[PDB]
Amino acid sequence: NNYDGDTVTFSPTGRLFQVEYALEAIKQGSVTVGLRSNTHAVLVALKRNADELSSYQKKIIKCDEHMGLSLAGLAPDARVLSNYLRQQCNYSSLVFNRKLAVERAGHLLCDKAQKNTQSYGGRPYGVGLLIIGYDKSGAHLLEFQPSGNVTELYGTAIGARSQGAKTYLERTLDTFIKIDGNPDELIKAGVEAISQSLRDESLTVDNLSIAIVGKDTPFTIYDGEAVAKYI
Amino acid sequence: GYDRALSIFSPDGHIFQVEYALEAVKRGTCAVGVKGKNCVVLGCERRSTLKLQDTRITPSKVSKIDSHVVLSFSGLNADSRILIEKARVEAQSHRLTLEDPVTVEYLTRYVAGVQQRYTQSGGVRPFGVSTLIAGFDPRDDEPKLYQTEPSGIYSSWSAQTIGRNSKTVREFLEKNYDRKEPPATVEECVKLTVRSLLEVVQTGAKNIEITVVKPDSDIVALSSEEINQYVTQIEQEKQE
Amino acid sequence: MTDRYSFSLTTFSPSGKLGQIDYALTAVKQGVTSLGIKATNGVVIATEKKSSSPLAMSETLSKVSLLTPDIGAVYSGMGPDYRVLVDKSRKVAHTSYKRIYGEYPPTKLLVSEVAKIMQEATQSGGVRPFGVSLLIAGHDEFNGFSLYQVDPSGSYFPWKATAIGKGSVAAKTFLEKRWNDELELEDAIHIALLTLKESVEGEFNGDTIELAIIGDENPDLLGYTGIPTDKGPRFRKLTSQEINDRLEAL
Amino acid sequence: QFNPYGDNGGTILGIAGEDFAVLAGDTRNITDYSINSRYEPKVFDCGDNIVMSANGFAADGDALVKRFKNSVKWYHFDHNDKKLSINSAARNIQHLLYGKRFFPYYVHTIIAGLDEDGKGAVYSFDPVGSYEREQCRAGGAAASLIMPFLDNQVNFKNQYEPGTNGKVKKPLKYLSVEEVIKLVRDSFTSATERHIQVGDGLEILIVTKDGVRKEFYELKRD
């Protein structure tokens, strides 16, 4: 109200409204789902078009051979944060001959987002990210909020109507975590999860975006006729 | 440093600081540019609210940027000096590196670029100045006349006016300037320029300045008497 | 962090007033009365040592300060602002003059430097004006004795005699009646003590009054002998006893 | 005084075929009269069907290869996983090298692969980034021993057709990958005999449309 003019101002109840408004941009964004087993991790993203002449905005970005994310909210902010992740993954490989742990990647994203919430002149990031990866401790899924909060999960969803997919994953938890050594079934579970967030529209061939990373699987994004198999 | 964003968008998509800079131009004395077949004439209004002025030393309204290009303006006088200095430096820099003097369009594009820069740089306000830039490209006999404004947009004109009551003199020029047959001589071009200012000026005395620019760096400012002869001949034809 | 106040805090109001300067002058008006009187063979500057508490040792608080061996200063208004201005004035006398010309600055030029510092606090980004008016008395070879007033705006004026602060209006009228161009230093000191008594409520003695003079060279205060051209400082702060002696002849 | 440079010996050889390219190099690493390693790989698969070797001062060599591999990675990120063509890689390496024009990578770089028409390509660089597409290029210690032999046996220089006596040149017939590998092996066998810094092992990377293949051969260890 009087305390939402900038990110450097607490409200009387201890809230940061600019951060909450940045969080609101994610809720307006298109739905994207993340889920994993013990061998693979999967991203599923509903891409959004401007109209029938336009392309469908890409949602998934590769960060390294073993890591990448999906976005919901301000796409240019995701580009800034994903670029930063690419650099940090790259720094780890070049300097230490070491693939960047997914948990450490989350810590770095948290700290980068935090600096934009405590200083004058800046603004919070207006995007949520779902980071998947396969490192020395197996498959991982992270949920990034521009408040700085990064959370390791078995499955989740962010964007508009993400609550339907999140409840489904909460029911299916005991099933999809056991889908080991079967990439296609794990993706099916993700495509079924994201279907719980659809209204009026359904998953078409240029609508659906899927990514996967696993034990012997580099982070690869599937678009176009490559996802028709799952429609 | 001072970094405050003074020029910003309003809810209706307007940048008020740029629009208020135009209001400063509206207040400035009227300037007019008319290009003939083999010349360009820059006319300028001098408000007669200031007498006891020393006209030898008082900053003249038309400024040479190089030997072949001139610049006149309407709006804040102090602001115009900064644009004129920058333009003059750039003109010499161009000669030094390209080994050829600036084209009138290039010089216009530069000045317009400076004006634009001041509409989205932090800590600065836009120039309260619109300019008329006239001359001839090196080894070219085609007349050139351009206009710039605070926003940084620029364009070429067969004839144009800026400043106070420029709506009235543009009205005159739009009905009196024929594109198929522009003022064929210096005389005709100067006459049409003086006529256009007489719609707005008041007394045709020391209130009208006229500068004629011809090809090959031939620039001359008309004196009071020379202009006074045009003023005399115009009204004697009008008494009919 | 970083000082993000890079804009002026003093600006022109619609009426043409610089508010912060006017308010600084109001703070000076509330300040304790100080005065200066110029004689033919010296200058005197004086003020009241308004002790904040009787437990406080008011001798440790110097309202009258040596700037150079031949220049002294007194103030009315905010003490802390004065103290830092004295530090800057002392330094600028060296950096912008003595380290260049090998001699101390003339009164008018040191005043000019102090005035410049005060002017800049009136225009520079993220600062308020100094809440003091200074009276600077001094002597130099080519200008003789002089007395200057410096205001928060950075404006300075030379005076024969003047007063600033609390009871300045009454004090200036008192000085107008008494001042002439034939006063000796002792006459000016006498007038200073008379003028200052009017604005002082409580105790009026050498312990509650601070008084200094710019007069003859004091070779006894030089600290060394052997150089004929060096004859000692013209600034001298009067002792508590010296003031009381002249209060009997009052 | 600290000398930031050193000489790790080694000899490399790039030959462009009609639809293939080979980049070979010995596996011996040395300083002065000592052997550091009898097997230290010097020719590297850099992705996008490009092979590279930066011979000379091994620290600068490793740094350059590392930075180029990194450039391939970021080329994919920035340009929608587009394949870096050999000509584009070559121009990119010029800028990497010239970037240190006043403190050069003390190496002679050679890259090999296929051009955008599928034909064999070899590019050769000097330490500060001047480069050219070449058919045949030896680099390093025994380059002066190998190049004249290649001029004679690959380009048939000074060879004329018997009976014509200098009037008709020996025609420049295309060599197979098996033929090139024979000349590479004989080049390195001969270089090993007469150059003290050449020996131990020979590693050859062969580039075709099918990808990158490796071959290793023993060289004399004295």
Next chain:
Amino acid sequence: STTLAFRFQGGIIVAVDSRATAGNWVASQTVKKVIEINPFLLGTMAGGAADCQFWETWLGSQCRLHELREKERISVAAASKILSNLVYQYKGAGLSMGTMICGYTRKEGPTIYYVDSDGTRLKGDIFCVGSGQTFAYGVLDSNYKWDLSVEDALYLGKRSILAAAHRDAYSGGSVNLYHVTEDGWIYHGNHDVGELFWKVKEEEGSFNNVIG
């Protein structure tokens, strides 16, 4: 190394040898010593190979930006000066460059500028740069006329490089010929010096000192 360029009635002839040496060791016989800055401008390579290559393709980028901004072909004067001003900034750092910037525009006609790494920029009709420059100058000076045909001018440039290739130990390999016209340069082939020498010796009757 031997590079030359000369102005004539039909435009400009640019001729260069092909040899690169490191001491006595002949590093290459197939070096491209003409840099195709763009379809209308040519530069020659002498001194530092990298310095010439790098900064003259950089020059091509500046020329392209100029014509995008100004909607007009850059003059040879302006193009050469961009390069000379650049290398002058680096003066003292150790750049090694001796080049002819060659072009043919409407306003200038055929124009050649000699540009140097110590900042020299000279307009001229005939320039010759490299270890074998003196030999090529001899043939050029004694046979040059403004009214040479394109055919004879091309041969003169070829013959002058051959003269240098023969005598100068650090010149040879092959001769590259270019003819610069107002509508752009035209490449006139690579000519092996070995084969060219015997051909010229027989047809011309020159080099009687050499047994063939």
Next chain:
Amino acid sequence: TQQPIVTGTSVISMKYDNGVIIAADNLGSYGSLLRFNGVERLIPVGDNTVVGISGDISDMQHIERLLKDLVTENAYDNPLADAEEALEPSYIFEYLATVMYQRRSKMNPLWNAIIVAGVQSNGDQFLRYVNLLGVTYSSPTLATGFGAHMANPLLRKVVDRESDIPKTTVQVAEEAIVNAMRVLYYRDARSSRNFSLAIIDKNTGLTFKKNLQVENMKWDFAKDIKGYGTQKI
């Protein structure tokens, strides 16, 4: 640019069937003065890596602190710091190799030759060299300074190529290392009798041996040697 002041001589090492051995004497020389006699030049990092350093001792102590800091830093926000996300020999080496090359590129080198010996997570032997120039290389046997000239020839007689490594036991390897240290003591004027030896084995882990001495020395034959040519008495 500097010059080394207090220096450590050879570091020697080799691979064997189940791991690596590394050794270095305990001397810190000051030119020809054998100044410091209790200098540890093998520095263990965790339980899987030993970094052996020769050259400038002040730079060695700096590197030692970098490695100590590396262990602290790795443990930060790392629940698997003592398991899957522990420091590998390859991580430690690549970090040092980066630092060495960066420092030489600023013309301010760490005046050292370094051998990182260890065993990787998968049981693979790690043995790689890096020096003040940032030059790196790997070999079945590695040695710095004098060791390169005298130890390598002896150690290469045990493991001459990659295929000899599985045939070489820890007893044969240690015996070869210990003999090489004796040979270096005979022939290197900047060596000492006292040394340290570290074994990193994929089964038995890190065994660090301090206060070892060169023994079984041959000197008796010196009694018969008289004069420099013609002298009989």
Next chain:
Amino acid sequence: DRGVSTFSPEGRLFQVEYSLEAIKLGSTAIGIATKEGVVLGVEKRATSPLLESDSIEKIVEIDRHIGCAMSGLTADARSMIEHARTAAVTHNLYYDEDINVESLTQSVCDLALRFGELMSRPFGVALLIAGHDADDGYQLFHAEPSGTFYRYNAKAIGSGSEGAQAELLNEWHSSLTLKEAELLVLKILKQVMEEKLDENNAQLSCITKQDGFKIYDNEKTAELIKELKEKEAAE
């Protein structure tokens, strides 16, 4: 007042949303992508008859294979064009090749959100970036001041955009010829323009693989306008 980088309660940047309003006031620009080339057309909208309309430059070349049309505060586009041209030329210098149309567009869009308290405000201009590369063929992008760019088969920006976009919705199909696209841009420009469309107040351009980017002569466009009039009178 309030930060330039402030979020609204709806989660939108005020300044970006306001710059979009300025673009709505701009003159109409239309792009149509076909398999034979991409056509770019603009409304010139001269403020007076004394303004020489061929000095109005709202269609611009970025490289031989990339063109660009603008709508809104057109003075803001000049630094965006400069950056685009530099990016195109720089990439050719580094890689000895043409830059991808998408990569060029992405490079331009990276400038967009570099504002705060960098430039003091977002750009008040939208761009239609049209081009060709070997990997993705003929492409048309819409670059906004939000930093977002969408690829389009056809797109209209400016004051007549929603009416024009509805028209483009009906008219575009994947088998359009270059000639059909030219007439289609002219037809829709004529529909949404205040003044009557002719060769002096409207401009056409195209990008083809063979000839690259070309701005059409007024004589060439005048013929296409006459061809348009006759085919509309044909039924």
Next chain:
Amino acid sequence: GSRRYDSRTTIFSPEGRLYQVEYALESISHAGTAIGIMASDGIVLAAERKVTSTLLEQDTSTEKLYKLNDKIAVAVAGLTADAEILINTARIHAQNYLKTYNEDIPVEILVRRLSDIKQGYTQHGGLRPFGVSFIYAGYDDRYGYQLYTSNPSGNYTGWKAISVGANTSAAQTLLQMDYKDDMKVDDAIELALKTLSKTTDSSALTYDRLEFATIRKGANDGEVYQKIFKPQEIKDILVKTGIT
């Protein structure tokens, strides 16, 4: 953060005016009147000190008239402290020019420089403008005797006769009425003092309330002399012109 307290000194009003410049001009209108009059054989500078005191040391006092170099002087109207900042900068510019070209700075070049400094404070920096209007009286061998004025906007103009400070409307009308082109310095001296005598807000015009200066070629042969009048000399010229 800090934005909250920023007055934004360098912005246009909806009418296209610079707030702070306009308000600085309002400030200057309350300053003592300064008058410059240019004659064929010299220039006159006359200025009124603001309501003074009998204890003010006039002979060492300077608030209105300042020397920039041997050829150029200024009359000040506004904040004296602001004026001295600019005056010192102008003095340095004159010397920089003299060092560079080995010739005295032409009057207009100095005036343009100071005016450009004033302009800068109206367009960038976020600082308040200088609340000062100058009258420049100077001589150079190109244009001879010149009068200029500059104000907080950084705009400057040339004049035959001009006033700044208080009652400029009344003063300018009086000057416009009695000024003629063939006028001489002694006539201009009288006009200036008569104009101040009529426009002053004080009861009477006396020597202690005035500062006076002349720039004459009344320096022995082809050279120029500046004369800052002493208190006694101002008293004499007041009697000579018949005002006291």
